[PDB]
Amino acid sequence: EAEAQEECREQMQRQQMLSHCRMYMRQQMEESTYQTMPRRGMEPHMSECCEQLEGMDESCRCEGLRMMMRMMQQKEMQPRGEQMRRMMRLAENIPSRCNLSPMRCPMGGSIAGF
């Protein structure tokens, strides 16, 4: 855990992506029909949160998802087994879209390219 972690954690507050992100979860509920992300112009809902990570420092991005993921469920752990289960894969895809060759993640002093 690098001392610069504070910069990351602090910035996370600014990155209030969880608001739109939370909306995305709800969107998943309604989107339960079309949830399958189409190549032709993907859903903007996901893109909304994408900018936040994308705007968040790379090293901070690692901690961001971890903190946000836990915070998301904590804020309002949506109740759903089969439905949300599918969302899991989609969830990882959201940050993939903004993901970028990460050199090192100060999250527990990663070894390889986290």
Looking up residue 97, the CATH number of its domain turns out to be 1.10.110.10
| Tokens coding 33 | 């029909």
Give the span between the Cα atoms of 86 and 19, in whole angstroms: 21
- Closest by Cα among 14, 30, 22 to 69: 22
> Which residue range(s) make up the domain with 15?
1-114
| Residue 112 φ then ψ, to 5° | -70, -165
Helices (H), the chain: 5-14, 17-30, 44-55, 58-76, 82-98
Instruction: Say how many domains are in the chain.
Output: 1
- Closest by Cα among 81, 87, 94 to 50: 94
Residue in the block written with tokens 């836990």: 70
Give the span between the Cα atoms of 89 and 92, in whole angstroms: 5
Which experimental approach was used here? Answer: NMR
Give the span between the Cα atoms of 4 and 13, in whole angstroms: 15
C-alpha torsion sign, points 107, 54, 99, 97:
positive
C-alpha torsion sign, points 20, 22, 25, 31:
negative
